[PDB]
Write a protein that binds this ligand. Structure first.
Ligand SMILES: [Ca+2]
Ligand SMILES: [Ca+2]
Ligand SMILES: [Ca+2]
Ligand code: NA
Ligand code: NA
Lengths: 26, 147
């Protein structure tokens, strides 16, 4: 539970970076 | 209904490689510690080993990418968009205050988004901190993560 959540939160933040770069461009 | 594209696997590999900083295909306790420490945490060796143990399916003491992918794809399949944001906020809200300081979130972002520039992280924080009080509260985080 807790361990999985820590790894998955990293991915979710990296996903946010990807979307932010897309919105900044288009 | 929960297939993985090539791009999705590459995105999970980017998350894997955040921890596998030497690129040998395994995450060790030391590598996990390097990340957690960079976020200002101080896990013990036993705490690091227990974390590795939850994902290490074959018990050889490290996490490889098939183990990581198994855990990450299962988490994704089992958790909805609103739930995963909620849980991620609580990961970064270390003291359970309902806030992440702007300075803390900037440091988190610089360390988890290794190729981000300072200008980009600044823009992300300015967008996240809607009211500009220097704190990113829960609903501010939800709205930054859903945009
Ligand atoms: Ca490694
Ligand atoms: Ca293993
Ligand atoms: Ca705020
Ligand atoms: Na907090
Ligand atoms: Na960077």
């Amino acid at each position: 539970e807790v361990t999985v959540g820590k790894f998955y939160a990293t991915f979710l933040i990296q996903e946010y970076f990807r979307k932010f770069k897309k919105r900044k461009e288009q | 209904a929960d297939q993985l594209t090539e791009e999705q696997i590459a995105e999970f590999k980017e998350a894997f490689s955040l921890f596998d900083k030497d690129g040998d295909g395994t995450i060790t306790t030391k590598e996990l510690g390097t990340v957690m420490r960079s976020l200002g945490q101080n896990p013990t060796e036993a705490e690091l080993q227990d974390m590795i143990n939850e994902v290490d399916a074959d018990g050889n003491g490290t996490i490889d990418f098939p183990e990581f992918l198994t855990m990450m794809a299962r988490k994704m399949k089992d958790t909805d968009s609103e739930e995963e944001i909620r849980e991620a906020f609580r990961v970064f809200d270390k003291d359970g205050s309902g806030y992440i300081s702007a300075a803390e979130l900037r440091h988190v972002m610089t360390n988890l988004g290794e190729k981000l520039t300072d200008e980009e992280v600044d823009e992300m924080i300015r967008e996240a901190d809607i009211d500009g009080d220097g704190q990113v509260n829960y609903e501010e985080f939800v709205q930054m993560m859903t945009a």
